Amino acid sequence: AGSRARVYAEVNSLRSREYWDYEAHVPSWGNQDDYQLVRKLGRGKYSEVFEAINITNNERVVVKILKPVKKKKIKREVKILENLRGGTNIIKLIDTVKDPVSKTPALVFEYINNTDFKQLYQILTDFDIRFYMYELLKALDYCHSKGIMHRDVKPHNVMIDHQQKKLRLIDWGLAEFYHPAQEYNVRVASRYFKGPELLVDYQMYDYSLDMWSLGCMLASMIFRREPFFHGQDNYDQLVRIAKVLGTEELYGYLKKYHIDLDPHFNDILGQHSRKRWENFIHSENRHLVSPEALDLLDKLLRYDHQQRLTAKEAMEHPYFYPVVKEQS
Numbered sequence: 001a002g003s004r005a006r007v008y009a010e011v012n013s014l015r016s017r018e019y020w021d022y023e024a025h026v027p028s029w030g031n032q033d034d035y036q037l038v039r040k041l042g043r044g045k046y047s048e049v050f051e052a053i054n055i056t057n058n059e060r061v062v063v064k065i066l067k068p069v070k071k072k073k074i075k076r077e078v079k080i081l082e083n084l085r086g087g088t089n090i091i092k093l094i095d096t097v098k099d100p101v102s103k104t105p106a107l108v109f110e111y112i113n114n115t116d117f118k119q120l121y122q123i124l125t126d127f128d129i130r131f132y133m134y135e136l137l138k139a140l141d142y143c144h145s146k147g148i149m150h151r152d153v154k155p156h157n158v159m160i161d162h163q164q165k166k167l168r169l170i171d172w173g174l175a176e177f178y179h180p181a182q183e184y185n186v187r188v189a190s191r192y193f194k195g196p197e198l199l200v201d202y203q204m205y206d207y208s209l210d211m212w213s214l215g216c217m218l219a220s221m222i223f224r225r226e227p228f229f230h231g232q233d234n235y236d237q238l239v240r241i242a243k244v245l246g247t248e249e250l251y252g253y254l255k256k257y258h259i260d261l262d263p264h265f266n267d268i269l270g271q272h273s274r275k276r277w278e279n280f281i282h283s284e285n286r287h288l289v290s291p292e293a294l295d296l297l298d299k300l301l302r303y304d305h306q307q308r309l310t311a312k313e314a315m316e317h318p319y320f321y322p323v324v325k326e327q328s
């Protein structure tokens with residue numbers, strides 16, 4: 001009873017238990033022998049990802065082979081992806097398969113011909129940023145409405161085909177179902193995209209974590225500083241945030257939620273005023289920054305998770321009016 005989401009708070013409790021009780025989920029595991037691996041795309045602590053071809057129909061796909069011991073976590077990701085079926089700009093799960101001999105599981109996703117983000121983010125126009133952020137927000141509003149927090153929003157997990165103008169939010173392996181008053185593990189998200197709640201060990205967080213991460217992405221795009229908050233470790237990450245948002249403002253947040261602050265911070269936080277967002281503007285980024293971009297950003301990058309815009313409120317902001325007009 002410390003904090004709850006302003007939107008979609010009870011949505012899982014209003015659904016059948018089967019919807020959110022992923023430990024009880026029984027996937028249907030098809031045959032990986034239908035897929036030919038063509039090229040390694042990446043590796044992570046839990047998986048390796050390959051471009052592949054379905055030899056039965058010639059479809060190009062991506063196969064994520066799961067390090068197989070994490071059974072509850074596999075069920076979680078599979079159930080989440082089933083529940084998100086058809087969601088706007090969510091990567092499409094085509095099938096759940098196993099090597100028929102070893103029984104190692106894998107997930108098969110639609111292919112996206114993505115443009116490497118480091119390159120891409122140096123060439124985006126003002127309209128491009130509005131467009132891609134609006135499309136990403138559609139995915140977040142969808143998953144939040146489905147009772148799910150992504151918990152790993154970051155540029156790599158936002159595939160963008162800049163030629164076909166397609167965006168997909170990938171890598172649901174850290175995602176979780178939101179339940180009011182539930183305490184969650186704070187060891188989620190990439191360092192640079194972790195909300196202050198995670199950095200101060202506040203476990204009663206919600207969908208608004210993803211809105212901090214989105215705000216970090218927005219700042220990086222309009223200001224051309226990627227990542228925007230570049231901490232050296234989790235402690236320094238909060239310091240970098242506080243140098244922008246201010247230290248007195250941090251303490252007000254902690255007091256509101258009765259958050260205990262790890263005393264190692266006492267020696268490193270210093271004293272910082274809250275900075276004006278206009279301080280980040282210079283000749284190299286001025287064409288990407290508007291009053292409406294800064295107003296939106298200011299309402300996303302807030303310590304107080306409750307006061308951040310929801311994905312829907314963000315979509316409704318004037319910054320996106322030019323995109324809505326084109327889509328209509």
Ligand SMILES: Brc1nc2nn[nH]c2c(Br)c1Br
Nearest residue numbers: 041049062109110111112170
């Ligand atoms: Br899922 C997925 N994961 C990837 N990792 N690197 N490129 C990737 C693509 Br494209 C997809 Br689709």
